[PDB]
Design a protein around this nucleic acid. Structure first.
Ligand code: CL
Ligand code: CL
Ligand code: CL
Ligand code: K
Ligand code: MG
Ligand code: MG
Ligand code: MG
Ligand code: MG
Ligand code: MG
Ligand code: MG
Ligand code: MG
Ligand code: MG
Ligand code: MG
Ligand code: MG
Ligand code: MG
Ligand code: MG
Ligand code: MG
Ligand code: MG
Ligand code: MG
Ligand code: MG
Ligand code: MG
Ligand code: MG
Ligand code: MG
Ligand code: MG
Ligand code: MG
Ligand code: MG
Ligand code: MG
Ligand code: MG
Ligand code: MG
Ligand code: MG
Ligand code: MG
Ligand code: MG
Ligand code: MG
Ligand code: MG
Ligand code: MG
Ligand code: MG
Ligand code: MG
Ligand code: MG
Ligand code: NA
Ligand code: NA
Ligand code: NA
Ligand code: NA
Ligand code: NA
Ligand code: NA
Ligand code: NA
Ligand code: NA
Ligand code: NA
Ligand code: NA
Ligand code: NA
Ligand code: NA
Ligand code: NA
Ligand code: NA
Ligand code: NA
Ligand code: NA
Ligand code: SR
Ligand code: SR
Ligand code: SR
Ligand code: SR
Ligand code: SR
Ligand code: SR
Ligand code: SR
Ligand code: SR
Ligand code: SR
Ligand code: SR
Ligand code: SR
Ligand code: SR
Ligand code: SR
Ligand code: SR
Ligand code: SR
Ligand code: SR
Ligand code: SR
Ligand code: SR
Ligand code: SR
Ligand code: SR
Ligand code: SR
Ligand code: SR
Ligand code: SR
Ligand code: SR
Ligand code: SR
Ligand code: SR
Ligand code: SR
Ligand code: SR
Ligand code: SR
Ligand code: SR
Ligand code: SR
Ligand code: SR
Ligand code: SR
Ligand code: SR
Ligand code: SR
Ligand code: SR
Ligand code: SR
Ligand code: SR
Ligand code: SR
Ligand code: SR
Ligand code: SR
Ligand code: SR
Ligand code: SR
Ligand code: SR
Ligand code: SR
Ligand code: SR
Ligand code: SR
Ligand code: SR
Lengths: 56, 73, 237
RNA sequence: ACGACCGUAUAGUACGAGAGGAACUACGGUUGGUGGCCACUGGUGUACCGGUUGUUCGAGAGAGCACGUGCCGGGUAGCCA
RNA sequence: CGAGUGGCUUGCUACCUCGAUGUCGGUUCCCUCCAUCCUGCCCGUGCAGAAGCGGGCAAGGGUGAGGUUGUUCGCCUAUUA
RNA sequence: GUCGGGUGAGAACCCCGACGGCCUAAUGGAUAAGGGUUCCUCAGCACUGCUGAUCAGCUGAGGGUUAGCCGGUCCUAAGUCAUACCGCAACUCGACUAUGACGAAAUGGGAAACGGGUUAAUAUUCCCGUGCCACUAUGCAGUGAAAGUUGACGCCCUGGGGUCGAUCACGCUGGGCAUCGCCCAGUCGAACCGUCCAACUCCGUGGAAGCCGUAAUGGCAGGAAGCGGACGAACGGCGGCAUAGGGAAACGUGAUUCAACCUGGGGCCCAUGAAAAGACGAGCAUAGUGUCCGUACCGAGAACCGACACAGGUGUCCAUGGCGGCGAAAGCCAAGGCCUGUCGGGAGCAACCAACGUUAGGGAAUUCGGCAAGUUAGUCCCGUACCUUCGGAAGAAGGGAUGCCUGCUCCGGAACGGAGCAGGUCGCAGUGACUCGGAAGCUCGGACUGUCUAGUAACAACAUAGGUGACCGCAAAUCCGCAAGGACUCGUACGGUCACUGAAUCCUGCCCAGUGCAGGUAUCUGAACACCUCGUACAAGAGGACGAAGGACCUGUCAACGGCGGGGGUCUUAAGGUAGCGUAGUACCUUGCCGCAUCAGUAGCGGCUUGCAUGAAUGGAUUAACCAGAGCUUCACUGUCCCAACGUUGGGCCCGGUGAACUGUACAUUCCAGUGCGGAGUCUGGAGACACCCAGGGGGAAGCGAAGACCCUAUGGAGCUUUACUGCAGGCUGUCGCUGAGGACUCUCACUCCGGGAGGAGGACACCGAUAGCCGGGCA
RNA sequence: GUGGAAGUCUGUUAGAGUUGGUGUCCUACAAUACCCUCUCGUGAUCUAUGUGUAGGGGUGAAAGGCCCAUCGAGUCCGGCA
């Protein structure tokens, strides 16, 4: 069984969903953690300086 | 005996399974009454079909050499 | 390279844990106030998933229903005793002090009241040899002379299930079923059969440990494989 | 677009003590190659005719399906060696 | 011992190609060379004959089937002008 | 698909009918995930659709999902999170321990709903009929109430009860067919309420010393059979429900085999097959309440994932429709669905290609190799070798039979079950299609089933049982974490960790010098702190004494890394290759030599063997069984071949419509020679050459595709190794702090461990912080 | 005779897999597909959903295999021009 097309058919699991806090479809319904805003992980909002060029 | 094992495994492995299971299934004299009606129920567990005495013993025999020693001393 | 299998173990991931949620009970001796006024009746004999040996369910006078590490020869109906004044009969538990020298015991406590640590496997037994006011000398299954506080409790008799080791597994499938009842990763791939990145013995055209197998006690994890601090090897000499 | 060989007569002759043993020429055939043709023999022939298994159309009659014929036998034209 | 020709063997060189000209052997299909194995015509012989052996002209045609081995090569078998 | 017709401006593909077909574990029915309006209606055809389009999953506009009893909701599973506590420089980080919560929509547990009717689209939800559950209120009854039971459970074999379905017999209703007299359909009717009870268990009676019983095991004076009794089942029987409903009508009755469902008996485990909420226990009447969320549709060769209306991938149940047959097999056919695995028209339709049928004689000559194809085939009877671990080998091999029809026998309660007999009879052929093994021998490897390189490797590689060695007494060995802590472990030597070999059988020799590990160690060497000397009004510093682990040195150890040669009748460096096997999957020489077999055999097998360079758990030898493993031979068979032919289906070719991509410095009708950076359509010399187009097989454009995976170069990269360089974890060891009192000692009071607790064990040690020496490819 | 064991046999039952064709395809139906042959199919079996293990780390009956078409060290953004 190939890793390509044939294995794409088994994908019918729901993981990332609309997030209650930020509105993005990044709330992982299995981990109960938003990969976009950190909801479920931290009270503070997920943020990182590498999300932009260093001197900006 | 080890006939269910067909031509597989070799002599010893199934020679022992035979003797062991042969002595394992013989009718054993119940410690309670004296009837030879004890049968294994599982690993180290024996029961008499006559009086229903359920007790512990060897894994494949109701009594082991060391087990028979305790009585003495 | 990469951490060896022995190192993956310590992390205690599912692959390496024992099926605890399936285990029955902790066969520790009952805790008596004193006097030995504790007696129970063997209500049933059960299989113990964690030891491949039988265990007995006892109902004690005061109303406690607990599984017990059963010796050979215990059956339903039989009455068991646990206390300093318990009768010297197979299946009863009492401190070594109260035990007559030359009597096989099992589930021997390491430290008084711990519940039992030694001689708990199928068909084994410790052998109480010497008594005293300060030290009870017991000979354990490995044949070593152990000095114990005479206040350490034990059960008279040998453990049930003896001889379990006399019959060969014959099939890999049988080994398999037993291994699924333990905290062990099985089957076993030889170190020599792996790539150099995976084990000290891996690598090389043909298989062979490119080094002596006797490793130092001081070796770090990842390197301590093969024959650990062997005092000797082989069958000769 | 023809190449080569075998055989017969020449001749058991010439030659040679003998053993052995030619040629010119005239013939018959084989082989390899070449071009064409189907009266003959052979192949094919899901044109066609027949036999027959399972099943469906109630039986009978007559049919469908079972892969481009269910299977088997025979085989015209045509094409072929 | 001396003098040459070929470019089928091997070696040498590093001139062409590293933004790639796909290895060996075999197979299939086509053209060619002659230093000729057979076939045609000759000369010599230690050429009676038959046959050998050596040489000359000559490239029209032919040069096949098999056993081991991937083999090329080679060894082997029965045929063959 | 075809002929008619319908609608429309327009019809091969939108609809009707007929005829012809396709799908049967699916191409039918219900659904999970996922999608998200794709569902229904009307009006449309610019877009989407492999052609067209009046059609649609497309466009426009509206509409559609109704619940006490179907899910959710409730419970807890592996396990997750939150709070507290602790760690961490710190946190959104981290382990334990408490608490709380979360965690199952087909498919875990679980209070209660059936039948019919209705709509364009919902429907156990609405409507009609009938019924049921929980809670609460009122009334009567009731003092019981929590012990127990249930929820609640593995694998294999099997009896019994029993519904649906299917089939058989006869009747009734309707249909079909028309030489017969046959063939088809229907003949209905729930939940619920009530009632019946087989099995199991137990009691009374009885009194078996050999009887009772089973498919089988089994049972009994500790009381068998027989007799009577208590408890006790179905999603089952029976009655009601039902002058409910449904049907045009009839609106059956018995039987066999019996999925569901109920209830028993047996066997297996070095394997033991959830939990909790809840329920029962614990009556009845009447009334009231039963909110909240889901509900359409697709569920796939067009509604999901794969960029697509993708030949892929994707769970559940329909596993009992008919013939067939052992069958949930093939083949054919129903119910039901479809003609959308969606472009058509034309040419006896050429070459060539993909699938495939048939080939005379020869029969593996073909080829690296029988690759491909073929041969054999189902069932019954006869019969069956070497070898063997006594299981097997084995369907060995080899031989014979096989239909139909007429009348019968036997087994069984019987089957629309099975085994035979006699007579008759047809064909080339009776497992007639379909289904359906070719067989035998020798050798190598791995014992076996099992595993693997998703996407060029299925093997001899990995695993395995078996053998062996190593570590550790549990405050352990091994391992994870910076720490708090943790896996192993509800474990305790018959254990579990670390390694090697790889079933059985017969065996497993010699070597401890080097390296590794381990133990010992008079003497030697061996750091820091403290101490002493010199030096400094002090300090830096120099030296000394003491000396831990470690090393030197000694010993043990090869199923520890590994080794077992050359020379002469010992030497390096410990020993000097034993049993076995041997030209090997190891032998260069080598196609070794002899033999077998063949017309001929670098192959294969047997023997020899001085082995370039076999050899004993780096396991040796050997071996029945097994194998999509490597090699060899034989019988049978055949278009593999001699040597090709003819035929079939789909393409190819012509026509309508649709309609890309690769590639392109320029020029370009070339050929023969030469030249040129030595491999030119383009330079030179000749030759040839009127332009354009169709089909073709691919000689050339050193054809197109990819800034060569080879090779080298770069004071390039990475993965791996080690007695490379340099370091870092980690372990061992000494010292200082924790740390107390009286080169050997006692004590208790810190501290540690055990204990529910009292208390016990230990104890200034250990743990922890700091530093010093040794080891240190585990890591950078 | 009964019994019905087995990492037991046959088997396109469901279901799992993939020896050969070096067949078809190779701007594909498909960035791993199609057909025939072949292997397993009561167990170390297959399968759905839930759940856990995370990057020098997992997971690995070991092939440097697998960790979302990529693995002798994933992916994303940043260091970074
Ligand atoms: Cl084990
Ligand atoms: Cl639902
Ligand atoms: Cl029974
Ligand atoms: K090159
Ligand atoms: Mg315990
Ligand atoms: Mg496990
Ligand atoms: Mg192994
Ligand atoms: Mg490897
Ligand atoms: Mg390594
Ligand atoms: Mg050069
Ligand atoms: Mg090229
Ligand atoms: Mg010449
Ligand atoms: Mg002459
Ligand atoms: Mg010529
Ligand atoms: Mg319309
Ligand atoms: Mg509907
Ligand atoms: Mg389609
Ligand atoms: Mg023929
Ligand atoms: Mg040949
Ligand atoms: Mg073949
Ligand atoms: Mg009868
Ligand atoms: Mg060989
Ligand atoms: Mg194998
Ligand atoms: Mg592969
Ligand atoms: Mg394979
Ligand atoms: Mg082993
Ligand atoms: Mg072992
Ligand atoms: Mg090995
Ligand atoms: Mg192996
Ligand atoms: Mg040989
Ligand atoms: Mg040895
Ligand atoms: Mg080895
Ligand atoms: Mg380059
Ligand atoms: Mg290279
Ligand atoms: Mg590097
Ligand atoms: Mg503690
Ligand atoms: Mg390194
Ligand atoms: Mg899963
Ligand atoms: Na020359
Ligand atoms: Na010539
Ligand atoms: Na040859
Ligand atoms: Na009933
Ligand atoms: Na049937
Ligand atoms: Na169409
Ligand atoms: Na198998
Ligand atoms: Na040594
Ligand atoms: Na050796
Ligand atoms: Na196999
Ligand atoms: Na053919
Ligand atoms: Na060309
Ligand atoms: Na690398
Ligand atoms: Na028997
Ligand atoms: Na295959
Ligand atoms: Na990494
Ligand atoms: Sr696939
Ligand atoms: Sr899935
Ligand atoms: Sr969180
Ligand atoms: Sr931030
Ligand atoms: Sr414990
Ligand atoms: Sr405890
Ligand atoms: Sr190695
Ligand atoms: Sr030895
Ligand atoms: Sr003549
Ligand atoms: Sr003569
Ligand atoms: Sr047909
Ligand atoms: Sr046939
Ligand atoms: Sr180039
Ligand atoms: Sr010439
Ligand atoms: Sr000549
Ligand atoms: Sr050559
Ligand atoms: Sr040669
Ligand atoms: Sr139009
Ligand atoms: Sr529609
Ligand atoms: Sr919940
Ligand atoms: Sr459920
Ligand atoms: Sr099951
Ligand atoms: Sr029955
Ligand atoms: Sr619906
Ligand atoms: Sr459906
Ligand atoms: Sr599909
Ligand atoms: Sr139909
Ligand atoms: Sr269309
Ligand atoms: Sr014919
Ligand atoms: Sr051949
Ligand atoms: Sr041949
Ligand atoms: Sr036969
Ligand atoms: Sr695989
Ligand atoms: Sr493969
Ligand atoms: Sr062995
Ligand atoms: Sr040594
Ligand atoms: Sr020898
Ligand atoms: Sr072997
Ligand atoms: Sr010119
Ligand atoms: Sr062409
Ligand atoms: Sr099997
Ligand atoms: Sr291949
Ligand atoms: Sr084929
Ligand atoms: Sr491909
Ligand atoms: Sr099978
Ligand atoms: Sr079966
Ligand atoms: Sr991948
Ligand atoms: Sr950057």
């Amino acid at each position: 069984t190939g890793a390509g097309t044939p294995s794409q058919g088994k994908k019918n699991t729901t993981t990332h969903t609309k997030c209650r806090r930020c509105g993005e479809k990044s709330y992982h319904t299995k981990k109960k953690v938003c990969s976009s805003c950190g909801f479920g992980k931290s009270a503070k909002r997920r943020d990182y300086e590498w999300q932009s060029k260093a001197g900006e | 005996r080890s006939g269910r094992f067909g031509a597989r495994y070799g002599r010893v492995s199934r020679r022992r399974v035979a003797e062991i299971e042969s002595e394992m299934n013989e009718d054993h004299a119940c410690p309670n009454c004296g009837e030879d009606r004890v049968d294994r129920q599982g690993t180290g567990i024996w029961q008499c079909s006559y009086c229903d005495y359920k007790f512990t013993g060897g894994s494949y025999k109701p009594e082991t050499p060391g087990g028979k020693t305790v009585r003495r001393s | 390279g990469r951490r060896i299998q022995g190192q993956r173990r310590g992390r205690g991931t599912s692959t390496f844990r024992a099926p605890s949620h399936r285990y029955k009970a902790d066969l520790e001796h009952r805790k008596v106030e004193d006097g030995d006024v504790i007696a129970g009746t063997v209500v049933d004999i059960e299989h113990d998933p964690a030891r491949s040996a039988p265990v007995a369910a006892v109902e004690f006078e005061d109303g406690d229903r607990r599984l017990i590490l059963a010796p050979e020869g215990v059956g339903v109906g039989d009455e068991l005793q646990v206390g300093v004044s318990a009768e010297i009969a197979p299946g009863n538990t009492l401190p070594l002090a109260e035990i007559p020298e030359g009597v096989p015991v099992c589930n021997v406590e390491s430290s008084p009241g711990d519940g039992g640590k030694f001689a708990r496997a199928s068909g084994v037994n410790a052998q109480l040899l010497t008594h005293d006011r300060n030290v009870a000398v017991v000979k354990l299954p490995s044949g070593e002379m152990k000095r114990l506080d005479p206040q350490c409790r034990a059960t008279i008799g040998v453990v049930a299930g003896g001889g379990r080791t006399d019959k060969p597994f014959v099939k890999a499938g049988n080994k398999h079923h037993k291994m699924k009842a333990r905290g062990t990763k099985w089957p076993n791939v030889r170190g020599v059969a792996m790539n150099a990145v995976d084990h000290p013995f891996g690598g090389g055209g043909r298989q062979h440990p490119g080094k002596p197998k006797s490793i130092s006690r001081n070796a770090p994890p990842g390197r301590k494989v093969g024959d650990i601090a062997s005092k000797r090897t082989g069958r000769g000499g």
